[model samples]
Target: HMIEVVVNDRLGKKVRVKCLGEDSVGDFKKVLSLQIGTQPNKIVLQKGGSVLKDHISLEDYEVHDQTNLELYYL
Candidate 1:
């Protein structure tokens, strides 16, 4: 199944994307890359006060419908 999540940038721009529970954080990063014009490796995703690992799935991070994720540029 697919889930919706909110990604907030430093400028407070929010981009909402649909993701499969089985998709990796790296996968989401790539999606974010297209939306924000940043490289996948340069984007960082976080949730619940912790940084998310690229190798792990969104399900691994307990992401759900309407989950809010923060983004940082490296």
Candidate 2:
């Protein structure tokens, strides 16, 4: 199943990054960074109002494709 992630920036602008397939939060960010012009060290991922672990994959977080994944600067 695919899900859509809505990523929000500091300016309240949202970027939509799709999961594409089963992956960790890290993978999702990798894709998001490319599309949103965010650097690896400068990205902070959030889901369900909680910060996600950088090392943890999306499988652990159950992230789906086309889902909203909010991001901010760390």
Candidate 3:
């Protein structure tokens, strides 16, 4: 399913994201990539207080649609 997820930014912003559940996590990261002009692999994606590594499929995390994920970058 093409589920919705919100990407965090600044102190008060959300990317209002949506993507296919079967896609790699970077597929979502690309959304952040284009926005920040930073490398996708370097982006830190936090899920449930844990870091989600690159190329991790959503199935492995069992993520639902419309959930929230955080971003931390160097």
Candidate 4:
């Protein structure tokens, strides 16, 4: 499965990433790198104003379809 996530940075730039599912938040860092040019350790993943874990499942978090994940420097 593939999921699409929209990330809004502090600069108000929006970055979208569409990739395979079952990957960790840490994994998404690589995809975000394509658009933001940043390292994974400096990024934070959040949904609904709450941070997400690298090992948590999207389904467990109830994320689906065009989910907007906020990205900020950690």
Candidate 5:
């Protein structure tokens, strides 16, 4: 199934990216890097009160549908 992730920055802007449920956080960061102009390693994603791990899938975090996540750069 497809999931929509709403990525928000400190500047108050948000970017939407769609992906499959099984996709890894690493994969999300790779895609987000392009939009946020930051490298994958420098980007941090968090949702549901936990920081996401690069090797873990969104499914692992119980993320579903259009979830809003915080994205920041190191």
Candidate 6:
């Protein structure tokens, strides 16, 4: 129960990270691709069906620190 944030993909791949206050979601892709096996350019994210942007901060969706984010591929 100590993880700050958890991101998951369709195939059950997951990543845990924090600090929604900075760092572009675009850059965040590096962490996911590096941590797991997803391709950086193929990664996409969403909070439900909002269709998140990698070039900008996911915080605009008003992400809670302890919650989770959705990861997907194209």
User: Model-by-model lDDT, in order?
Assistant: 0.87, 0.73, 0.75, 0.76, 0.85, 0.69
What TM value does model 6 have?
0.72
Root-mean-square deviation of every model: 1.0, 2.2, 1.9, 1.7, 1.2, 3.2
Could you tell me every candidate's TM-score relative to the true structure?
0.91, 0.74, 0.77, 0.80, 0.88, 0.72
Tens digits of lDDT, candidate 1, 1-74: 87898998889989999878798999888987987787998878889779999899998898888989998888
Best by lDDT: 1
Clashes of 2: 18
RMSD of 6: 3.2
The alpha-carbon lDDT assigned to residue 38 of candidate 1 equals: 79
The residue-level lDDT of candidate 5 at 3 comes to 84
Against the true structure, candidate 2 reaches a TM-score of: 0.74
In the range 10-52, model 6's lDDT, one tens digit per residue, is 8786778754446667766776678777677987777766676
Clashing pairs for predicted structure model 4, backbone only: none
Q: Which of the two, 1 or 3, has more TM-score?
A: 1
State which candidate, 1 or 6, has the greater lDDT. 1
Sorting all predicted structures by TM-score, with the top scorer first, yields 1, 5, 4, 3, 2, 6
lDDT of 2 by residue, 11-69 (tens): 99988766644666677778878887877677988877788887787766766665556
Highest TM-score against the true fold, candidate: 1
Q: Which regions of candidate 2 deviate over 4 angstroms?
A: 65-67
Tell me the lDDT of model 1 at 55: 93
On the 0 to 100 scale, the lDDT of residue 29 in model 3 is: 83
